[PDB]
RNA sequence: AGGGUGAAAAGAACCCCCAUCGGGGAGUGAAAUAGAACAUGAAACCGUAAGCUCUCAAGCAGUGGGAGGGGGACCAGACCCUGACCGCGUGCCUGUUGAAGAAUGAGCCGGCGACUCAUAGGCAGUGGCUUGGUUAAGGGAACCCACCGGAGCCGUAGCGA
RNA sequence: GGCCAGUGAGACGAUGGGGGAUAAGCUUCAUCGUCGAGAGGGAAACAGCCCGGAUCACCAGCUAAGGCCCCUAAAUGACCG
RNA sequence: CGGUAGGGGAGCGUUCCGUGUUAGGGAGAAACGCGUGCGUGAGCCGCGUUGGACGAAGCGGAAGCGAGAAUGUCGGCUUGA
RNA sequence: UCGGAGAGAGGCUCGGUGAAAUAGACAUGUCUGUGAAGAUGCGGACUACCUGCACCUGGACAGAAAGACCCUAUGAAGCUU
RNA sequence: UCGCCCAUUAAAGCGGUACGUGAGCUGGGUUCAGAACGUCGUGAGACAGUUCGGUCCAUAUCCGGUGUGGGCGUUAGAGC
């Protein structure tokens, strides 16, 4: 034969998982309405 | 405390006898009747038996003289065989190199035990469970109660 | 001024052994092998404390998913989480999953009034 | 509490992150109560129910049991051992103040 | 020819205990003969 | 290569096993869990006893989670021993571009076992003096040491063979 | 500029070339990435590819790269081929 | 605030000396073995058993001063059995 | 060819005495894949109660001797002109 | 090894397995020292040039195999 074959990191070049589909590349995080202001957490008033 | 007077630790030692070959024999008589043991040790086919036999009979005679309880009662409670003091001959071999052969020794110990010393106390506790006879605040339940010490 | 070592060695190797005194076989009773093994024990502890945080979460998610699928035929964890944030509702996965176990009534109640 | 949820019922204690500014015996109210429950339980639409505020008391601010952090790398003579006792706080829950809002449960 | 490692522990216990059980068997047989020694045998 | 019973040999009369050795009572002694193999007595290694626990398992032996069982003469949501079953986890060192490596080294356990000292040169930190500083040998009811010894050395002028 | 080090065997990948048979996990230079000296996640396992630079704790949360039948977290989701 | 070679800073212990023929100690020291104290760590600190007489601090000083690797070396004891 | 039978000395069993080289730790399967390119230990499968004794040597890059070949060292030593 | 040849025969297949297998065997070949021939070398010596002579270890720990037991398991225990 004369097809030298893919080995070492050259395998890892070829058969790495990757998206390569315009719609799947976009997307990102999901948007929301942020939130009304919340109270403290642990107010004291004692001793 | 649970015993202390149910025994006599005869410990015949520096016997010229490998420990493993002594443990062939002594593993059989850990917990037997003394009569039975003697019948075994004379008929057994071992060099190992003779010094063991001597110590069993010496221990039982010791127990009969010193603490004065019956040979027909007693048993072998704790038999135990430990490593002695090793001697080292240097034998030759072929082609000039030399190797050691060892004369091994042992320390044999036998703890005999009377069955019926604390039997008066144990047979009395044929009394069934929910009893708690509270006489001296707790008292003498000190005689190998065996089954549990769940006294919270 | 000759300085014998004596005391200083096994007073630390006792402490080394104190760790490994639940280990099985050679590892429990052999100085240099204990010293080799203790290190590895501590490393696997430190490594697995961070695995802990993600793995518990991953369990909880599966619990919640399992709980929520028993309601409607087509309703599923993925939708459920977005429906929580759609209504602005900051219950974390731990609470949700643990109530799903200990009080399924309450998951029924949360499921009922999130849909509307 | 410390960006960390807890189911909490009255007459009962909890361990938390060390509350910065809190005394040894000193009662406090937790105003981040995302859920309440009884016979007729009550979820929340938004966050916090509305005027529900849990009532508790600080007990003690002792440190946690030692966690041993251990950096190690293979063959590089890089053993680095370092303990860490995170400071925590013990708090005891006295009562839940009633909800008076959005009754769920069918 | 030569051993690669040592058996070390636990395995050597298992190996020795069977050998001591050989001793046990001999003890049983010798116990059995003592009763035969008592009474008859013609 | 091979030291350490005790203050004192007081080194075990007598009795039992018994041909010896050795052993158990007795006796001596503060102690004989100091008996001549004797003082403190670590580890490896060898057992004996108790709590739990393996015979459809696959495993650098741990680790996170923890079923069921057991506690410690001290009433704990606390703590300890075991550990059903799950997930993770390629012994250490040297030395390499790269080592789980089937590269090297160690059977295990305990000891011994390696950048030191003398004198000089540079530099830094610290101190003393700055009327410049400092003494060397040598002398001291020795050695240190008050107190002398200014002989020399360093700084105070360069330029040029 | 003072005092005082190690290094001077490199490796792979992208590109520009040389040598080779535009063979080599080959060799030699030039520019840059990673390893070397870098854990974590994706790649079944897999130094060198992709994501991302581990001060430490939390039985909180959002996401990158990559994924959503079961082993094994997430759609046995949708509409058109 | 990842980190090999490598450099810089801050410490812990070891025996011995000054203080000290200190207090503490045959109502139990050194040691030896255990701790549901402490510290970032080297390590520290209290315990009652075994042990049977030595000897902490603190402030300072000096080194035969810290071991797992040397086919190291001496002694003990395994494995093969 | 083409083996067969028998005698001794072993081997095997019982009692007595009792070594050795080796040994990081060993809870030490097969297949194919992976990786310092030839794995009991890494991935996926397959197979497999626990434990002796007798026999057999394919593997543990089995043991033995810091390769005696090859090359290096401004190493050593013999011999020649 | 390969090869050629004789007598056959249905046929005298070609390869992998560390050019399978030396802790299974052999030691004829090839890598030690002796000695010789041709040759190269002033010489010591040299030459996949040739010739004669020349010490092949091992008691199986583990995996793996061929046999063969023992334990336990199979839910009360057994013999068929």
From Swiss-Prot, chain A:
Subcellular location: Plastid, Chloroplast
Entry's transmembrane regions: none
Family membership: Belongs to the chloroplast-specific ribosomal protein cL38 family.
Quaternary assembly: Component of the chloroplast large ribosomal subunit (LSU). Mature 70S chloroplast ribosomes of higher plants consist of a small (30S) and a large (50S) subunit. The 30S small subunit contains 1 molecule of ribosomal RNA (16S rRNA) and 24 different proteins. The 50S large subunit contains 3 rRNA molecules (23S, 5S and 4.5S rRNA) and 33 different proteins.
Chain's role: Component of the chloroplast ribosome (chloro-ribosome), a dedicated translation machinery responsible for the synthesis of chloroplast genome-encoded proteins, including proteins of the transcription and translation machinery and components of the photosynthetic apparatus.
Protein name, per record: Large ribosomal subunit protein cL38
Residues of the full protein shown: 48 to 94 of 116
Curated annotation (Swiss-Prot), chain B:
Subcellular location(s) of the protein: Plastid, Chloroplast
Gene Ontology BP term (one): translation
Highest taxon of source: Eukaryota
Keyword annotations: Chloroplast, Plastid, Ribonucleoprotein, Ribosomal protein, RNA-binding, rRNA-binding
A GO cellular component entry from the record: large ribosomal subunit
Entry coiled-coil feature ranges: none
Main subcellular location: plastid
GO molecular function: rRNA binding; structural constituent of ribosome
Described function: Component of the chloroplast ribosome (chloro-ribosome), a dedicated translation machinery responsible for the synthesis of chloroplast genome-encoded proteins, including proteins of the transcription and translation machinery and components of the photosynthetic apparatus.
Subunit note: Component of the chloroplast large ribosomal subunit (LSU). Mature 70S chloroplast ribosomes of higher plants consist of a small (30S) and a large (50S) subunit. The 30S small subunit contains 1 molecule of ribosomal RNA (16S rRNA) and 24 different proteins. The 50S large subunit contains 3 rRNA molecules (23S, 5S and 4.5S rRNA) and 33 different proteins. uL22c binds 5S rRNA in vitro; the central segment of the protein (approximately amino acids 30 to 124) but not the last 28 amino acids are required for this binding.
Membership in a protein family: Belongs to the universal ribosomal protein uL22 family.
Full protein name: Large ribosomal subunit protein uL22c
Organism of this sequence: Spinacia oleracea
The organism's taxonomic lineage, starting at the top: Eukaryota, Viridiplantae, Streptophyta, Embryophyta, Tracheophyta
Full protein: residues contained: 25 to 176 of 199
UniProtKB/Swiss-Prot annotation, chain D:
Organism taxonomic ancestry: Eukaryota, Viridiplantae, Streptophyta, Embryophyta, Tracheophyta
Compartment(s): Plastid, Chloroplast
Functional description taken from the UniProt entry: Component of the chloroplast ribosome (chloro-ribosome), a dedicated translation machinery responsible for the synthesis of chloroplast genome-encoded proteins, including proteins of the transcription and translation machinery and components of the photosynthetic apparatus.
Protein name, as recorded: Large ribosomal subunit protein bL21c
Similarity field: Belongs to the bacterial ribosomal protein bL21 family.
Quaternary organization: Component of the chloroplast large ribosomal subunit (LSU). Mature 70S chloroplast ribosomes of higher plants consist of a small (30S) and a large (50S) subunit. The 30S small subunit contains 1 molecule of ribosomal RNA (16S rRNA) and 24 different proteins. The 50S large subunit contains 3 rRNA molecules (23S, 5S and 4.5S rRNA) and 33 different proteins.
Included stretch of the parent chain: 129 to 234 of 256
The gene coding this protein: RPL21
From Swiss-Prot, chain E:
Residues in the signal sequence: none
Intrachain disulfide bonds: none
Top-level division of the source organism's lineage: Eukaryota
GO MF annotation list: structural constituent of ribosome
Location(s), subcellular: Plastid, Chloroplast
GO cellular component terms, semicolon-separated: chloroplast; large ribosomal subunit
Gene Ontology biological process terms, A to Z: translation
Keywords: Chloroplast, Plastid, Ribonucleoprotein, Ribosomal protein
Function (record text): Component of the chloroplast ribosome (chloro-ribosome), a dedicated translation machinery responsible for the synthesis of chloroplast genome-encoded proteins, including proteins of the transcription and translation machinery and components of the photosynthetic apparatus.
Family: Belongs to the bacterial ribosomal protein bL32 family.
Subunit structure as annotated in this protein's UniProt entry: Component of the chloroplast large ribosomal subunit (LSU). Mature 70S chloroplast ribosomes of higher plants consist of a small (30S) and a large (50S) subunit. The 30S small subunit contains 1 molecule of ribosomal RNA (16S rRNA) and 24 different proteins. The 50S large subunit contains 3 rRNA molecules (23S, 5S and 4.5S rRNA) and 33 different proteins.
Designated name of the protein: Large ribosomal subunit protein bL32c
Lineage: Eukaryota, Viridiplantae, Streptophyta, Embryophyta, Tracheophyta
Gene name linked to the record: rpl32
